[PDB]
Amino acid sequence: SNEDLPISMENPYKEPLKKCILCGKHVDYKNVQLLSQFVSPFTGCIYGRHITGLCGKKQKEITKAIKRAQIMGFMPVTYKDPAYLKDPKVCNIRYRE
Amino acid sequence: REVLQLQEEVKNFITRENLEARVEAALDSRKNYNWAITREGLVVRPQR
Amino acid sequence: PRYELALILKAMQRPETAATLKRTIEALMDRGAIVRDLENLGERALPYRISAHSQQHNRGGYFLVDFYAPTAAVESMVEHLSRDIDVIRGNIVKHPLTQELKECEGIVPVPLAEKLYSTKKR
Amino acid sequence: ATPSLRGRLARFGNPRKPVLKPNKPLILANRVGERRREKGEATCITEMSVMMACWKQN
Amino acid sequence: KNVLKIRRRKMNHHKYRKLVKKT
Amino acid sequence: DPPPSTLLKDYQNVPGIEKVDDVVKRLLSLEMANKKEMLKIKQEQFMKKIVANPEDTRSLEARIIALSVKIRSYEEHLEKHRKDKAHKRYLLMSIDQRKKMLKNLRNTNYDVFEKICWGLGIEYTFPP
Amino acid sequence: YHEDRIRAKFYSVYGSGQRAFDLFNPNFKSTCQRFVEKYTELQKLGETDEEKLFVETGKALLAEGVILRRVG
Amino acid sequence: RQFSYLIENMARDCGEYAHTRYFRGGMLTNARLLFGPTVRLPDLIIFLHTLNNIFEPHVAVRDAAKMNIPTVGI
Amino acid sequence: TKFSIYPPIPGEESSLRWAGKKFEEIPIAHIKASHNNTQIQVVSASNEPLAFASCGTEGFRNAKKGTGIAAQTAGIAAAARAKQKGVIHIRVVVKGLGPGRLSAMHGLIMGGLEVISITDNTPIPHXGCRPRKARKL
Amino acid sequence: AKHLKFIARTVMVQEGNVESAYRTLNRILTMDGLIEDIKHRRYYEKPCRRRQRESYERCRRIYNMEMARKINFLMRKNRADPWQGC
RNA sequence: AAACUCCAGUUGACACAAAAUAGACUACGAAAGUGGCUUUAACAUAUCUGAACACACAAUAGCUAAGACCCAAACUGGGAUUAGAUACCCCACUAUGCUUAGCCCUAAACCUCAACAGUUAAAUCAACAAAACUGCUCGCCAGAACACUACGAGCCACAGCUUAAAACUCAAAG
Ligand code: FES
Ligand SMILES: [K+]
Ligand SMILES: [K+]
Ligand SMILES: [K+]
Ligand SMILES: [Mg+2]
Ligand SMILES: [Mg+2]
Ligand SMILES: [Mg+2]
Ligand SMILES: [Mg+2]
Ligand SMILES: [Mg+2]
Ligand SMILES: [Mg+2]
Ligand SMILES: [Mg+2]
Ligand SMILES: [Mg+2]
Ligand SMILES: [Mg+2]
Ligand SMILES: [Mg+2]
Ligand SMILES: [Mg+2]
Ligand SMILES: [Mg+2]
Ligand SMILES: [Mg+2]
Ligand SMILES: [Mg+2]
Ligand SMILES: [Mg+2]
Ligand SMILES: [Mg+2]
Ligand SMILES: [Mg+2]
Structure with a gap:
């Protein structure tokens, strides 16, 4: 018949699925430097996923690790350890504007 | 394969014979679990 | 199974710290534990002032003990650590490396929910 | 990103209990709320205080 | 729906408990 | 219960495990495992x-x-935890599901059914 | 279409060609379309490896004077 | 409204009629009152765009069917 | 150097000085901003009381204490007494969301004191004692 | 009580600009939810009332975030009328 | 106003109470319920349906016995308000909220939408609400009120719970 008729395929132009910054990386409660990146510098509050940008699976892991480290004597609760204030900013939040 | 790997790790396990020697070695060494993540998903190990 | 003892020790000199570490490891072995490794995380200022055994501690030596013990040993060891005056805080958790991370493909987009309300003209 | 509405409301397909209980249908209207006037507040309280304080002194 | 049916049952039960207490 | 030195079901048939170190043997034994492995x-x-x-x-x-192995585990748990209503429900439900299985087996295969009752020490009772 | 697999790969490797698409001209051929054409011509020769066939396609265009600046 | 001028010229050129403006209610179902008792309604209505400016069917589509007037439509 | 809103850490070495004194040595002005009163106590870096003033001690009574002007007058009173003892720079630590939360600091500045930092220490229990029941108004 | 003081919720004044410092501090507490949290803690909010408020605040976020998404999508069409007179 | 001044602020020591943020997540459990940390045990069923009562559970309140004391708080007392105020507002303090061991077995226990399987075709379809339906099974309902009542029976319940009528009355109730 005719060879120009559309054929059945999976979308070849489909882009790869997005991945959170922590995708494929183990989150440890001992890694206080990583955990501090997701808490408020002034109040120590854990940031929501809309700020942190983490996936649902990693947001839970970070939350559970922060809570564990804070009660085991590794992480402060009411503020962010000043030693980690100069680490890379990975959270979409602006306090001065 | 797992049993073979385990049989190799047990060689380094702490025992009552090497307990004191292993305790001194631990006091001298330092282990760091801290590292940071960038907005690009790259690990930034600590420089110390 | 495999456990991890997060041991925050009192700020002491090297001879006393060695005695405490050996005493703690011997207690684990006495309860049937196969100690695998001992890691020194270094002495740092505590995140908050911890009051233990009628003493206010502001500094401590952080250590890690990797060991295999029977399930019944965990409760016994927790009791022993509570009675040791050289230990500020002691916690036993299931070793994190035993837990395997499932492979993640990525974030799948969720489309806006549809057909929540009838299409009648209001 | 807008929070999800999948499984949030009590519907026949939804097996779980409802997360949300909107009192009005979650449907965009053709209008927005009117601009609200700012609440009036007393002005020049500080300047009044310094004048009244000096009167007491003098 | 209004609560007129519940209100009638509410008064019945109140008066009943008051009667039982008295007697 | 199986002796504590018993090797795990997964590692019981791997070749050469009888000659490994004693530490490796007890690390792969029931003593160092959870209740479910036994x-x-x-x-x-x-x-x-x-x-x-x-x-x-x-x-x-x-x-x-x-199911009878699960039933026995619930009875051991409930012996320690007497006010655990969640597990008391699981035990009673498991017992009723084994009765239904036994009734279906009795109706289909009697020779095999009798062997189940003998081995597992289960006495078949008719409902009231 | 079968060539969408080629077009998707080309756009990923090289990106949008410098030549701007002129959709007004019905006979306009883009750098990607030229690649598909050469790719198909080399497929008729009897090449069975996509990666090898993709590499050969790029080499033929480079010889013809086409500018193929990879994203890298 | 991008083609209102074009369509009004095309109708005048072929000696026909165009309605590219806001369609007032009752132009077809109430014509004898709007125009006069002896007004003659269209015999054919050609919709070059069948949707109004709120992306809903042009009202005359329904009213043309009420008046039994055949309609051509893109 | 760029201005850092974050306070200097006591352990680390900083170049910021106020009258030759480090951040850890500046006296502290504790402001308790309640719904019905504002209390201001100026203490030294070693917790030695220097001055105290509240809306009640300034002659305001009943609902007149819970006003901005009443708190501002209390701030000026505390500043006057604190300046006699040698206080110039103060670290403000406010507690509560009362009407005199900001006015108290304005009074302290109007009294001749310089505020170098503002700390909020309003108590927030993390789960705590159950508060009084809601009012039926 | 146990933590080090003068690290949490502390803001430094720039050039004696206390007004801007208080606004910054007040903005930090609002963005974190402390201001709104403190006010709700004055009186006990019963669980059913807290669940009823959370449901209300969540339905309002979804509506407001969808209306804003439509405003920004249609703002392009605020242009002047191109076919004026047709 | 009363109350407090054996008060208040700073600093230090300091629970058998309650568990910010995360949570814009929507998971777990039969439901009731479950959101601080750790560990142990652990989440029935390879067809489905299947009970007011059998079997086992079941928020809060409440009962019995022994403990705990931060805060909250029926009742009660004081202050205020009011024509009165046995309320709404303020203060103080109980039972109670907690733990242990037994009861009691109720809820707008409602997501007022039963379990399992399947459909989106046509007249979709009273109205509103959360679109309209098919197969199959158990449970339940036949005007309002009397009536979450009387009597009988069962129950660790004894001012209780479950089951649950009739007479007279009306032409409506919904
Ligand atoms: S997207 Fe892979 S773990 Fe977050
Ligand atoms: K908590
Ligand atoms: K009921
Ligand atoms: K309901
Ligand atoms: Mg409603
Ligand atoms: Mg209403
Ligand atoms: Mg009645
Ligand atoms: Mg008085
Ligand atoms: Mg929350
Ligand atoms: Mg069944
Ligand atoms: Mg029945
Ligand atoms: Mg109960
Ligand atoms: Mg009780
Ligand atoms: Mg009290
Ligand atoms: Mg009491
Ligand atoms: Mg408790
Ligand atoms: Mg409920
Ligand atoms: Mg059923
Ligand atoms: Mg009842
Ligand atoms: Mg009765
Ligand atoms: Mg009776």
């Missing part, structure tokens, strides 16, 4: 003793054996 060996022993084909796990007989 339950698997219990199920294995009952399957070999009673069932004709231990490899077939979909048979009405294997399901009765597996």
Whole structure:
């Protein structure tokens, strides 16, 4: 018949699925430097996923690790350890504007 | 394969014979679990 | 199974710290534990002032003990650590490396929910 | 990103209990709320205080 | 729906408990 | 219960495990494992003793054996935790599901049914 | 279409060609379309490896004077 | 409204009629009152765009069917 | 150097000085901003009381204490007494969301004191004692 | 009580600009939810009332975030009328 | 106003109470319920349906016995308000909220939408609400009120719970 008729395929132009910054990386409660990146510098509050940008699976892991480290004597609760204030900013939040 | 790997790790396990020697070695060494993540998903190990 | 003892020790000199570490490891072995490794995380200022055994501690030596013990040993060891005056805080958790991370493909987009309300003209 | 509405409301397909209980249908209207006037507040309280304080002194 | 049916049952039960207490 | 030195079901048949170090043996034994690992060996022993084909796990007989192992675990848990209503419900439900399995087995295969009752020490009672 | 697999790969490797698409001209051929054409011509020769066939396609265009600046 | 001028010229050129403006209610179902008792309604209505400016069917589509007037439509 | 809103850490070495004194040595002005009163106590870096003033001690009574002007007058009173003892720079630590939360600091500045930092220490229990029941108004 | 003081919720004044410092501090507490949290803690909010408020605040976020998404999508069409007179 | 001044602020020591943020997540459990940390045990069923009562559970309140004391708080007392105020507002303090061991077995226990399987075709379809339906099974309902009542029976319940009528009355109730 005719060879120009559309054929059945999976979308070849489909882009790869997005991945959170922590995708494929183990989150440890001992890694206080990583955990501090997701808490408020002034109040120590854990940031929501809309700020942190983490996936649902990693947001839970970070939350559970922060809570564990804070009660085991590794992480402060009411503020962010000043030693980690100069680490890379990975959270979409602006306090001065 | 797992049993073979385990049989190799047990060689380094702490025992009552090497307990004191292993305790001194631990006091001298330092282990760091801290590292940071960038907005690009790259690990930034600590420089110390 | 495999456990991890997060041991925050009192700020002491090297001879006393060695005695405490050996005493703690011997207690684990006495309860049937196969100690695998001992890691020194270094002495740092505590995140908050911890009051233990009628003493206010502001500094401590952080250590890690990797060991295999029977399930019944965990409760016994927790009791022993509570009675040791050289230990500020002691916690036993299931070793994190035993837990395997499932492979993640990525974030799948969720489309806006549809057909929540009838299409009648209001 | 807008929070999800999948499984949030009590519907026949939804097996779980409802997360949300909107009192009005979650449907965009053709209008927005009117601009609200700012609440009036007393002005020049500080300047009044310094004048009244000096009167007491003098 | 209004609560007129519940209100009638509410008064019945109140008066009943008051009667039982008295007697 | 199986001795604590018993090797795990997964590592029991790997070649050369009888000659490994004593530490490796006890690390791979029941002593260093959770309660569920010992339950698997219990199920294995009952399957070999009673069932004709231990490899077939979909048979009405294997399901009765597996359920009885679970029933026994709940009774041991409930002995320690007396006010655990969640597990008391699971035990009573499990007992009723084994009765239904036994009734279906009694109606279909009596010769095999009698072997289940003997091996597992289950007495079939008729409902009121 | 079958060539969408080629077009998707080309756009990923090289990106949008410098030549701007002129959709007004019905006979306009883009750098990607030229690649598909050469790719198909080399497929008729009897090449069975996509990666090898993709590499050969790029080499033929480079010889013809086409500018193929990879994203890298 | 991008083609209102074009369509009004095309109708005048072929000696026909165009309605590219806001369609007032009752132009077809109430014509004898709007125009006069002896007004003659269209015999054919050609919709070059069948949707109004809120992306809903042009009202005359329904009203043309009420008046039994055949309609051509893109 | 760029201005850092974050306070200097006591352990680390900083170049910021106020009258030759480090951040850890500046006296502290504790402001308790309640719904019905504002209390201001100026203490030294070693917790030695220097001055105290509240809306009640300034002659305001009943609902007149819970006003901005009443708190501002209390701030000026505390500043006057604190300046006699040698206080110039103060670290403000406010507690509560009362009407005199900001006015108290304005009074302290109007009294001749310089505020170098503002700390909020309003108590927030993390789960705590159950508060009084809601009012039926 | 146990933590080090003068690290949490502390803001430094720039060039004696206390007004801007208080606004910054007040903005930090609002963005974190402390201001709104403190006010709700004055009186006990019963669980059913807290669940009823959370449901209300969540339905309002979804509506407001969808209306804003439509405003920004249609703002392009605020242009002047191109076919004026047609 | 009363109350407090054996008060208040700073600093230090300091629970058998309650568990910010995360949570814009929507998971777990039969439901009731479950959101601080750790560990142990642990989440029935390879067809489905299947009970007011059998079997086992079941928020809060409440009962019995022994403990705990931060805060909250029926009742009660004081202050205020009011024509009165046995309320709404303020203060103080109980039972109670907690733990242990037994009861009691109720809820707008409602997501007022039963379990399992399947459909989106046509007249979709009273109205509103959360679109309209098919197969199959158990449970339940036949005007309002009397009536979450009387009597009988069962129950660790004894001012209780479950089951649950009739007479007279009306032409409506919904
Ligand atoms: S997207 Fe892979 S773990 Fe977050
Ligand atoms: K908490
Ligand atoms: K009921
Ligand atoms: K309901
Ligand atoms: Mg409603
Ligand atoms: Mg209403
Ligand atoms: Mg009545
Ligand atoms: Mg008085
Ligand atoms: Mg929350
Ligand atoms: Mg059933
Ligand atoms: Mg029945
Ligand atoms: Mg109960
Ligand atoms: Mg009780
Ligand atoms: Mg009280
Ligand atoms: Mg009491
Ligand atoms: Mg408690
Ligand atoms: Mg409920
Ligand atoms: Mg049913
Ligand atoms: Mg009742
Ligand atoms: Mg009764
Ligand atoms: Mg009776």
